[PDB]
Write a protein that binds this ligand. Structure first.
Ligand SMILES: Cc1cccc([C@@H](C)c2cnc[nH]2)c1C
Length: 154
């Protein structure tokens, strides 16, 4: 019982782009660009579409960096999140009704205003490591249990 999602990080040598979400699931946190994969769509095509819809950016090369499963206790559907990175983009980030984008230096990542699991896996993403993760949540703030391991193949 799982639903496919994508999550894209625009990660350059000295900075990362994040979006402050205005509405819906994750509102009030800095997020990467992501959402549900559609019928007849590849996971990578879904990742490229979500980045354009949410940030206004066009991506060249996407790289697979991780897979994370999220459980919310009492909710039947697991989230199966496929995580990607890119450095090569075109366009300038667009502020919309849904998202306020900002660049962060890599020593100023706003973890206090991000999903709490990011403190565990974001440091692997920054050192170009690949990973498999599982996080069990109670509500949106409390991690009950987790596993996280580095892999050669996502
Ligand atoms: C839409 C979407 C896609 C992927 C993940 C997430 C959340 C659960 C998340 C967990 N840790 C970072 N973000 C959302 C909201």
């Amino acid at each position: 019982a799982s639903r496919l999602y994508t999550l894209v990080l625009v990660l350059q040598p000295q900075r990362v782009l994040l979006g402050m979400k205005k509405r819906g699931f994750g509102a009030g946190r800095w997020n990467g660009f992501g959402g549900k994969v559609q019928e007849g769509e590849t996971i990578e095509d879904g990742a490229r579409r979500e980045l354009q819809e949410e940030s206004g950016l066009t991506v060249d090369a996407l790289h697979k960096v991780g897979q994370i499963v999220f459980e919310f206790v009492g909710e039947p559907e697991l989230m199966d999140v496929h995580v990607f990175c890119t450095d090569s983009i075109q366009g300038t980030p667009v502020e919309s009704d849904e998202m306020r984008p900002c660049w962060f230096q890599l020593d100023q990542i706003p973890f206090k205003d991000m999903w709490p699991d990011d403190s565990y896996w974001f440091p692997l993403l920054l050192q170009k490591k690949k990973f498999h993760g599982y996080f069990k949540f109670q509500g949106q703030d409390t991690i009950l249990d987790y596993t996280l391991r580095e892999v050669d193949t996502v």
